[PDB]
Amino acid sequence: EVEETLKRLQSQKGVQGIIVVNTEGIPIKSTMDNPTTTQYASLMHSFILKARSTVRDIDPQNDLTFLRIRSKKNEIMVAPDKDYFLIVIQNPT
């Protein structure tokens, strides 16, 4: 359930990229090229960890579970978990 899951969620409402994070957003499984998938997933991973640190600065016993940025050109629905800081690059529809 790797490539079929890839195409399954990429064939949704304009999902430009989705990979469940192995560790620090760099899996071999790339839905797009090296920057958009690997580098940008790593940036969303470390910076969503910084967002975890933000809520941690607000409430240290409150890590992050999800993120949702549905706007003009994307529906970024990032979900940090125990092993993955989920990456979603989407379209508004």
């Binding site: 579970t65 999800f66 549905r70 629905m77 979900a79």
Partner: protein, 397 residues
Amino acid sequence: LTEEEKQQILHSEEFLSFFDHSTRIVERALSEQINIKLSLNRQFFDERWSKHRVVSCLDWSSQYPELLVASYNNNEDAPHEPDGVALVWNMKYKKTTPEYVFHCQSAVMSATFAKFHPNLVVGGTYSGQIVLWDNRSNKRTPVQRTPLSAAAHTHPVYCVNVVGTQNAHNLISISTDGKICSWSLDMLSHPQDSMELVHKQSKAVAVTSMSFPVGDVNNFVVGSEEGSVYTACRHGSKAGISEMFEGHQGPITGIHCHAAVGAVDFSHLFVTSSFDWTVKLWSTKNNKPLYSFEDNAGYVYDVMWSPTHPALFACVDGMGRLDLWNLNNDTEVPTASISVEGNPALNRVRWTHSGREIAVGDSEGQIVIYDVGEQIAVPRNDEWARFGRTLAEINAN
């Protein structure tokens, strides 16, 4: 970190669009989520703006379907509240909150939509005052108000619609005395064609929830306060309240004609869900009650024919019952004569712009909307033709 200059920037008018987008995007985040036969779509109940606010009319939006002006007449319970309230509601998101609130200064009666303008709302009132409601600003107060002179808008406009598309959009305000005043979709200084209709005698024809026959020409039926239904226009000398449709037994309160013919015959017919309580069907060239329906309980006020299926309708009573009838399929029985919540006199029933959805304007505030997947456009043209024909025969034997 202080909020002195910050709260004074809040006091400034800099955040008008910011509060508008705050309302919209927080309502985008309204349906909270986690990551780990009538369908009854959604009842529209605002908290402050929809309580002791008797609904005026349910106008539908051409641009951005599944949107209606929840036009509320200012009831006697709220004189100090701003006279006349209109609301838009996102019928898809399933939000108990209206998308944008638009009250008025005159008692709103048949408020409509600024066609081809999602950022603007405009509609008539009790004073005939078609006021402008700007949606780009959070100014719920009417930014532009129609004059209330003698020859101008004076009587309650229950029909303020354009003629056809934006080509020759003549937003004619048909009032309770015949003061027909055309307009455009955006100008609100002086009406386009300020004039007045003429009746056979005693010109004060209180029109009430009229419509247009199939073709949607300037010919408008009359929701006259005395039965004996008429048809007139505003363009030229066709503004005569004289084509009497005698045979009715009460003030025409709910009258809606045949919608755009798509699955049935042409049949320029209009049913009259009025004070006779036994809803009467009528053709635009009949002058006889084509078909009298069930004797409803109490004062009937609204009806509308679905834009999907242009032959069926949904009449009401005075004791809260939505009698939605099928015509090409049945004659003496309706489809689902449901009873709306409580037993009030149902004010408005207007089918959704998308079709197959009945918006029942309730008592005060709340708007119970019955979604249907049964009142579909069944391809029965000769059946509906023979229906109106046989009852156009039985109307006078």
